[PDB]
Design a protein around this ligand. Structure first.
Ligand code: NAG
Ligand code: NAG
Ligand code: NAG
Ligand code: NAG
Ligand code: NAG
Lengths: 430, 137, 98, 49, 48, 49
């Protein structure tokens, strides 16, 4: 009897840090005698660099597919990228809108996305500024540049976070202004009414309750922003990606301190206490041990990069079917009753906001599955049932209690009665 | 007389002579990224996360006439043409940057990378009293 | 023998008893009201709409409702009887354990 | 080395199971609990329930 | 002209037996001379 | 040699799945095509046969 609009967040990881490791500086820092034994494993070092470059190529092609879906059939007006206004039809959307065009500074992220990047220190811009402010200065004891001097460095992706934020912004504008290139060419307030009508809600109840629907989207959007102060499930998955990558880099760096049980762990003290004839055996056991750690590290990257493309493929299908268009599929975009979904940029992935139809009140009423008229006729309702009030049969919705007169639009026609069809030779139709 | 940390690293030292305390910091042992075209005399260098002053003084003893500091680091043997955008880049450096080669100043141009754009229309966005402008084919 | 050498198999979180109970509720939700698995449509009446999608005169399906009910009984007994001599699906289930 | 080869095969085995598990979820939501208009997805051509 | 109803079956794998392996039981059960050498690697075992 | 066998077995199963979808519910007549009956609706489809 009484309904409202709810909200829900969803984070889908579509990216991963790009790690590049060198073969020489990791095993042999600067010792000339160390590189002599490594020359016998020249083919082994070439295979390590080929695997890492193969993983980086998969992250580059997947990032272009995300931008391709967000920039597919998008049309904007000319007098629009001049910092226009917002809040169309009393629906506040300034939190999901960044710079309207390129007439701003370096940062063009929406206010909602700012709450996500401020809680993640090792973002795309984080690794850049970290490697810059460690060559001298005041304090350079950070573990980020210690791995850089040992052969472990993280490269930035092809498209920066600023360009990705601009792509998600154009998708939102394409669904709020003409020619509405994100909703097959229908107005935004009119599109919401058709989505609710498909669930079994009458069309006339949506016109008189326009203020209740408009205030529902504003309350839902303001409620999804206040939840970022605590630790939700969306922020927990974002913080787990940066912590998982940091643990793998620190674990691989610890392999340089393992003695591998030959004479010691460091190569400088080997050449200072052992003669060349017996020093070749001690160094060979260190190279063979360290190369095993690199071989096992690149193997985990191939297995981990496969699950990234599996999750990224779901995000591509979701944008083209839940954001850029209205797919007739059920239980795919959200949970049961689904109305609309939006996409926002997130660190190492995307953020989706799903709006659903949530009833609040209920009312028990006797309904009928179907009935037939006189003369071996037959009718059946669609997206609704048949109720009998004041000794008269009328049509009602499947998601909202509203008696409607039986017409030829809300029912189907048959050629015979059924065994469980109630007889009622009182309704007349043409 | 020696300061250490959790992961067995030396980060401090006190002298047996006159009391002066110091610290141990690692030294630069990085690499350099070079962009080489199909046929050219010399490729374009790129020292990531390094200023042009630190490169031409400490790690490089040769004189380079062309030098340019970018967002990704000091760029050598290239020109600053970030105002121009391309969409068919073959030498990607990340962070939305590209290096293009133009046969005849260095032949390499440091430009941006915009692979996607929005199709703009000259129609208005404000209604004219209940009517909108739509480009119908 | 593998358990004494460090190779042991741990049971999952949800047992097969709880999983079997979840599948039962899904089947009941498509036979009795409020038909939570059929969008509020009765089971014998929903079959007529699915067949009508392919394209058939509804007067035949409305008249042959008795032949439709007897047809589903033969299909279920054929699947149950087929799981005794040589099942095609069970042959792949054994490959998971092997 | 044998343990590293076993965990490498285990990571590749679970990935195929994860892909097959996602396919089973779609059949529950779009073929069992609902009647999706997709053709040649739930069964083989003519599909009812 | 005439029609009937057929029925097929399909099996999709969802779960898998969970196997747990440790270092101190597979390399050497209770050999003290072996644990002093296996523990020298350190992180090489903890990754498994 | 065992892992290479399971790898080749997965490609053989995948090969049959692709061919099954191509021949799923296909009915042809006795009077055949491909230099027997072609050029329908003045559209040249000989290069695709
Ligand atoms: C639905 O709930 C709102 C707020 O609780 C209330 O203002 C409105 O009157 C209710 N509608 C009905 C039909 O009870
Ligand atoms: C350094 O400090 C200690 C602390 O008492 C002192 O004994 C020592 O004499 C100092 N060093 C010198 C060179 O004076
Ligand atoms: C490169 O050119 C751009 C645009 O002309 C300018 O903003 C930037 O400062 C230049 N970089 C230099 C001078 O290092
Ligand atoms: C269709 O086949 C069934 C079973 O053989 C039979 O009972 C029925 O009479 C047939 N209907 C027609 C119209 O032939
Ligand atoms: C339509 O008729 C013309 C003239 O008879 C014929 O050439 C053409 O093939 C026909 N189109 C069909 C059969 O699709």
């Amino acid at each position: 009897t009484n309904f409202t609009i709810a909200g829900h967040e969803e984070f889908i990881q579509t990216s991963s840090p790009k790690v590049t490791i060198d073969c020489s500086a990791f095993v042999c820092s600067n010792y000339a005698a160390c590189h002599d034994l490594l020359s016998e494993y020249g083919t082994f070092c070439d295979n390590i660099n080929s695997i890492l470059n193969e993983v980086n190529d998969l992250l580059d092609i997947t990032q272009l597919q995300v931008a391709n879906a967000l920039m597919q059939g998008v049309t904007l007006s000319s007098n629009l990228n001049t910092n226009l206004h917002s809040d169309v039809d009393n629906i506040d959307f300034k939190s999901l809108l960044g710079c309207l065009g390129s007439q701003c500074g370096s940062s063009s992220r929406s206010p909602l996305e700012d709450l996500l990047f401020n809680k993640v220190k090792l973002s795309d811009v984080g690794f850049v500024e970290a490697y810059n402010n460690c060559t001298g200065g005041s304090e350079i004891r950070d573990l980020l540049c210690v791995q850089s001097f040992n052969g472990i460095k993280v490269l930035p992706p092809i498209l920066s976070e600023t360009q990705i934020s601009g792509y998600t912004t154009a998708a939102t504008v394409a669904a709020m202004f003409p020619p509405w290139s994100a909703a097959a060419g229908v107005p935004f307030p009119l599109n919401v009414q058709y989505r609710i009508n498909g669930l079994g809600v009458t069309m006339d109840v949506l016109n008189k309750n326009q203020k209740l629907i408009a205030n529902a989207f504003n309350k839902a959007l303001l409620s999804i922003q206040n939840g970022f102060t605590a630790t939700p499930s969306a922020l927990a998955k974002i913080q787990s990606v940066v912590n998982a990558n940091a643990q793998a880099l620190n674990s691989l760096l610890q392999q340089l301190f393992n003695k591998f049980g030959a004479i010691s762990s460091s190569l400088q003290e080997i050449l200072s206490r052992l003669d060349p004839p017996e020093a070749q055996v001690q160094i060979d056991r260190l190279i063979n041990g360290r190369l095993t750690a690199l071989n096992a590290y690149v193997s985990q990257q191939l297995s981990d990069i496969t699950l990234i493309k599996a999750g990224a493929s779901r995000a591509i299908e979701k944008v083209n079917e839940c954001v850029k268009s209205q797919s007739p599929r059920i239980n795919f975009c959200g949970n049961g009753n689904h109305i609309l979904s939006l996409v926002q940029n997130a660190p190492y992935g995307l953020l989706f906001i799903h709006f659903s139809y949530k009833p609040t009140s209920f009312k028990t009423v006797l309904v009928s599955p179907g009935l037939c008229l006189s003369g071996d006729r037959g009718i059946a309702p669609k997206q609704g049932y048949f109720i009998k009030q004041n000794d008269s049969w009328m049509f009602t919705g499947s998601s909202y209690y509203y008696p409607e007169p039986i017409s030829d639009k809300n029912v189907v026609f048959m050629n015979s009665c059924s065994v469980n069809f109630t007889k009622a030779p009182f309704i007349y139709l043409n | 007389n020696l300061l250490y940390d959790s992961n067995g690293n030396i980060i401090g030292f006190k002298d047996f002579l006159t009391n002066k305390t110091y610290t141990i910091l690692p030294c630069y042992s990085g690499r350099v990224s070079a962009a080489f075209y199909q046929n050219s005399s010399s490729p374009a260098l790129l020292y990531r996360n390094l200023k042009c002053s630190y490169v031409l003084n400490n790690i490089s003893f040769i004189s380079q006439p062309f030098y340019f500091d970018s967002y990704l680091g000091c760029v050598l043997n290239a020109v600053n043409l970030t105002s121009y955008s391309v969409s068919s880049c073959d030498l990607r450096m990340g962070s939305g940057f590209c290096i293009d080669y133009a046969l005849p100043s260095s032949p390499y141009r440091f430009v941006t990378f915009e692979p996607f754009n929005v199709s703009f229309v000259n129609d208005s966005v404000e209604t004219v009293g209940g009517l909108f402008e739509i480009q119908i084919p």
